Ligand binder design. Structure first.
Ligand SMILES: CCCCCc1cc2c(N)cccc2c(=O)[nH]1
Ligand SMILES: [Zn+2]
Length: 210
């Protein structure tokens, strides 16, 4: 495929800053833990840099196009993605196969500021049937993987909220939380080339002590 994975050391400042973004963006969810499990923090087991020259140049080419359409502003963010297809994504890139057809902002590729939101989709929409081994959406034993991704939003359409195309004149959609005052924003792109899966994070959710 061209993809290689480089392990980061826990002593590396880059490992520490990615872990901190994982841990600090956990919130409680309105489903009481149904989809993603009950936890306040993670046990991070490994963080790997995803290196693929073809996929990177695909991303930067599209970033330059968006930028030039938006007064030299890519509006680039680092955002989480959770999916049963994480292993296809790191080898072949994001495409229409990784879209959420039934999502609140239409058929596109969804990203979260809250790591705990992406965690709800590790084992499928709604958490599917949970981990393959124990059939448990709150499994504390099995190893999970998330992507921390570089995403080009460009001009984003703001949706106040309780593959298709971007709204005309826009490069993405922003789902702004309008009820749960603790929820962070979620974002949708409609072209796989507008994201690069930069870090692969392997972790467990941790059982609260109390
Ligand atoms: C088959 C899995 C496709 C949807 C996965 C998915 C959905 C999703 C969402 N709706 C909002 C915020 C983040 C995510 C995410 O990180 N992943
Ligand atoms: Zn399990």
């Amino acid at each position: 495929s061209g993809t290689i994975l480089i392990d980061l050391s826990p002593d590396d400042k880059e490992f520490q800053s990615v872990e901190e973004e994982m841990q600090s963006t956990v919130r409680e969810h309105r489903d009481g833990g149904h989809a993603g499990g009950i936890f306040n923090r993670y046990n991070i087991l490994k963080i790997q840099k995803v290196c693929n020259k073809k996929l990177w140049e695909r991303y930067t080419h599209r970033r330059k196009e968006v930028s030039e359409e938006n007064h030299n502003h890519a509006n680039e963010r680092m955002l989480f993605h959770g999916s049963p297809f994480v292993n296809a994504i790191i080898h072949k890139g994001f495409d229409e196969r990784h879209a959420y057809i039934g999502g609140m902002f239409g058929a596109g590729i969804y990203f979260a500021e809250n790591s705990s939101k992406s965690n709800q989709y590790v084992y499928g929409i709604g958490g599917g049937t949970g981990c393959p081994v124990h059939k448990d959406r709150s499994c504390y034993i099995c190893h999970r993987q998330l992507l921390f991704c570089r995403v080009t939003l460009g001009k984003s359409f703001l949706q106040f909220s309780a593959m298709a195309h971007s709204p005309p004149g826009h490069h993405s959609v922003t789902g702004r939380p309008s009820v749960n005052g603790l929820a962070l924003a979620e974002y949708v792109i409609y072209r796989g080339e507008q994201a690069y899966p930069e870090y692969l994070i392997t972790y467990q959710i941790m059982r609260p002590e109390g």
